[PDB]
Design brief:
It holds the Pfam family Transferrin. By secondary structure, this protein is α+β, with helices and mostly antiparallel strands. The protein is built from 23 helices and 29 strands. The two termini are 45 Å apart. The structure holds the ligand NC1=N[C@H]2[C@H](CO)N=C(N)N3C[C@@H](OS(=O)(=O)O)C(O)(O)[C@]23N1.
Length: 821
């Protein structure tokens, strides 16, 4: 196995070569491939000449475009503010679940708020071991007849672990971190031999401008500092006197034309403060406008002559996006100021001097100057993280990740070099971790910075708030949507995706505005931050809420999942169904499977629903399992047993009810099944005038009730399907859809011209055909998860937790960003 790293300079190639020799990672060999600039390396990776390189966030954006098609895969983790510990958040969530779902696991947290390594389930007496995330170590479960297991101690905090590593078993003459009671870094740190002291934030990162030799006064160190994003800053010497608003005509040093801290951040501020006569691509390029602002600068990668005048690279290396240009990068821009080739340098806080005293200070955009350690209040914005990138195909992602993980475990010299600073990686980097598997530049940079960088390259025409771009998931839906657009007078437009999850992505990225989602997709949609705008109201009995919008809805009419049993079986209750014979509509059905399996796993330590029951019939299971012993199959024996078709006699709503009456104790079905197949409503012989009063439903409290009281004695009611959109577009989508519905709904004024809830092109296109109307979602002041799902469903299916991962999109769309207001 090989990893080919692309280097951009003679110096970087030298450092990469040293690592080939010094860093011994078994199974994976590092190799180094030289190119003359950042852009030539991005092309080498696209072409397969190399596999990986580390990019500034600005280049991560550029590399994500179709010319290169690269994606970020590895980066240093950062924090925005202090958060609750995971155990305490989990406790709060589980305690907020539906109390009618009894016997649920409530985590046990220790005096620091972390998980006790031994976790126990009070209602079942089972205990197990967990990792620091509170996730069960599989295979450690012990029954209550046994003593609690012996579980390894918690992994130490960063500070306590670095302290243990610094001691290394018996220390003298080296820095040993000082930790607080909670195991985080004390704000002030001192070197036990040199007498120097400095400040660190809560995860131990040094605050620049605070390093203090012994015998001098230290700057005040801020406590509980969990803001670890990097900040773009403008650095100047204290010997000059101009302010930020007088930058016109000065000399400047920039980390690079494509760097976020050296270009996007200052240019964004220049434009907002109207220092730069530029607003759109009608006034030419921004680089040309910047060329007229400064008298002479060094901006590696630039083409304008005066913007390369201050660079000192020799011959063709001059003004290159490469360390062979001595003023390239954060530390090159600072050197350019230090050597008086510029009056101001644009870089980020992590490249500022560590020492408190000296001739440098910060140039604030509010026309003041402030000391180096005040960058959090004297900056040009937070900037995104930087990242290792590879091809979008990801053919080398695993080898790249494995090599860097092992190299860091072995403490290879990745993050420094005698040859120079910020070679291969930023010298300030301490750890590189894998990004979410579905991350891309949009989700890595965040929508605010992604759009901000795009705005510098093109005039982004923001779509109209009077048009709803509807996302369709198949060709018939696209065609029905084009007919809607033709009658809509411009209110409706159409986009195409392959599946509802890709529609959610389009809405997040501003390519579409709305889509209707099945219940099985709403957890993902809500975790990515979309909101229900309107919902499909399916109650055929009551049309009052459709005629008079905003009025009270007595019954929304969604299905209720119930546990159906016979009146003769007096001994069966909810709490004793273990080992009994059950009948499910099919695997994957929400009322017949997802809701029952969710409650069973919630109350029995995630024990398989296959193992919970004795002999069941659930179409879709393995034919040899206990879940297919009850399944008959085709009465016209061909074997089509336990099959997901009508060939199975026990398939579907009617089939699961047949399984109950013929050979079962309980059936998991919607509440409408028993009424639609008893009282002689089904002509077949198996239900020869079967009586509805012959059956009852099981309540979660062990009691029972007649099938008529399904509203108060059910496993869970389902939420309605929802039309989702971005938070800032809810009001527009509601307004446009309600107006369209007054024209083309079931009582629309122009329903002869178009019908939203039917089509000759197919069934359930865009909306479900049995929809009565769309009802505005009335957002309540509570968690959107509980608001949309209802507490019962939220608890039964997701344990009332925001930590479930039913789609691998969730870790990417919840990745946190370094954005400004
Ligand atoms: N805001 C809000 N309006 C309701 C409508 C349905 O009537 N849409 C939902 N998805 N909901 C879930 C229900 O929850 S439940 O607990 O009543 O089942 C609810 O009635 O609260 C509701 N929440």
């Amino acid at each position: 196995r090989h990893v080919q790293w692309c280097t951009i300079s003679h110096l970087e190639q030298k450092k990469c070569n040293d690592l080939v020799g010094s860093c011994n990672v078994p199974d994976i060999t590092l190799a180094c491939v030289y190119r003359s600039s950042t852009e030539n390396c991005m092309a080498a990776i696209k072409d397969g000449q190399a596999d990986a390189m580390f990019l500034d966030s600005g280049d991560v954006y550029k590399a994500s475009l179709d010319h290169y098609n690269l994606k970020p895969i590895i980066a240093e983790p950062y924090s925005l503010h202090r958060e609750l510990t995971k155990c305490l958040k989990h406790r709060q969530e589980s305690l907020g679940g539906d109390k009618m779902v009894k016997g649920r696991y409530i985590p046990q947290c220790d005096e620091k708020g972390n998980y006790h390594p031994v976790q126990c389930h009070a209602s079942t007496g089972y205990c197990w071991c967990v990792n620091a995330n509170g996730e069960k170590i599989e295979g450690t479960n012990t029954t209550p007849v046994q003593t609690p297991p012996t579980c390894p101690s918690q992994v130490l905090t960063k500070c306590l672990k670095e302290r243990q590593e610094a001691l290394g078993g018996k220390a003298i003459g080296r820095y040993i971190p000082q930790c607080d009671e909670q195991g985080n870094y004390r704000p002030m740190q001192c070197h036990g031999s040199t007498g120097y002291c400095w400040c660190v934030n809560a995860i131990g990162e040094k605050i620049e401008g605070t390093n203090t030799p012994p015998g001098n006064t230290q700057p005040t160190c801020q406590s509980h500092d969990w803001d670890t994003c990097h900040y773009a800053v403008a650095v100047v010497k204290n010997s000059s006197t101009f302010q930020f608003g007088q930058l016109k005509g000065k000399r400047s040093c920039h980390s690079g034309l494509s760097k976020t801290d050296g270009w996007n951040a200052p240019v964004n501020v220049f434009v907002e403060k109207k220092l730069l006569p530029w607003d759109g691509l009608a006034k030419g390029s921004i680089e040309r406008a910047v060329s007229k602002f400064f008298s002479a600068s060094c901006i590696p990668g630039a083409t304008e002559t005066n913007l390369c005048k201050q660079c000192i690279g020799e011959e063709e290396k001059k003004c290159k996006s490469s360390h062979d240009e001595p003023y390239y990068g954060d530390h090159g821009a600072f050197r350019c100021l230090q050597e008086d080739k510029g009056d101001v340098a644009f870089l980020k806080n992590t490249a500022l001097p560590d020492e408190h005293s000296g001739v440098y200070e910060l140039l604030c955009p509010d026309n003041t100057r402030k000391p180096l350690n005040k960058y959090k209040e004297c900056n040009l914005g937070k900037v995104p993280a930087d990242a290792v990138v590879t091809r979008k195909a990801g053919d080398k992602t695993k080898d790249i990740n494995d090599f860097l993980l092992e190299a860091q475990k072995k403490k290879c010299k990745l993050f420094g070099s005698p040859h120079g600073k910020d070679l291969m990686f930023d010298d300030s980097t301490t750890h590189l971790a894998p990004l979410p598997s579905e991350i891309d530049a949009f989700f890595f940079l965040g929508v605010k910075w992604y759009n901000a960088m795009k705005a510098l390259t093109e005039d982004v025409k923001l779509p109209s708030k009077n048009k709803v771009r509807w996302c369709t998931i198949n060709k018939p839906e696209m065609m029905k949507c084009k007919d809607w657009a033709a009658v809509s007078g411009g209110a409706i437009a159409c986009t195409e995706a392959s599946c509802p999850e890709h529609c959610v992505k389009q809405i997040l990225k501003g390519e579409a505005d709305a889509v209707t989602l099945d219940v099985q997709y709403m957890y993902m949609a809500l975790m990515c931050g979309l909101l229900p705008a309107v919902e499909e109201y399916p109650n055929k009995d009551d049309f009052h809420p459709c005629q008079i919008p905003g009025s009270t809805i007595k019954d929304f009419g969604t299905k209720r999942a119930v546990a159906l049993v016979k009146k003769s079986n007096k001994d069966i209750k909810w709490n004793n169904l273990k080992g009994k014979k059950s009948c499910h509509t099919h695997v994957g059905d929400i009322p017949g499977w997802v809701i029952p399996a969710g409650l069973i796993s919630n109350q029995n330590d995630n024990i398989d629903i296959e193992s919970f029951f004795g002999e069941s019939c659930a179409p879709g299971s393995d034919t040899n399992s206990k879940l297919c012993k009850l399944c008959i199959g085709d009465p016209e024996n061909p074997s089509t047993r336990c099959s997901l078709s009508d060939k199975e006699a026990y398939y579907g709503n009617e089939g699961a009810f047949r399984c109950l009456v013929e050979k079962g104790d309980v059936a998991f079905v919607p509440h409408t099944v028993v009424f639609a197949n008893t009282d002689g409503k089904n002509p077949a012989e198996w239900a020869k005038d079967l009586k509805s009063e012959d059956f009852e439903i099981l309540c979660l409290d062990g009691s029972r009730a007649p099938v008529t009281n399904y509203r108060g004695c059910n496993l869970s009611g389902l939420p309605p399907r929802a039309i989702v959109t971005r938070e800032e577009s809810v009001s527009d989508v509601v307004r446009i859809l309600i107006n369209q519905q007054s024209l083309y709904g079931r009582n629309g004024f122009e329903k002869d011209m178009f019908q939203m809830f039917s089509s000759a092109k197919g069934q359930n296109l865009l909306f479900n055909d049995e929809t009565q109307c769309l009802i505005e979602f009335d957002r309540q002041p509570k968690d959107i998860m509980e608001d949309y799902f209802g507490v019962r469903y939220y608890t039964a299916v997701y344990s009332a937790s925001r930590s479930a991962v039913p789609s691998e999109l969730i870790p990417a769309c919840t990745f946190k960003h370094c954005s400004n207001s």
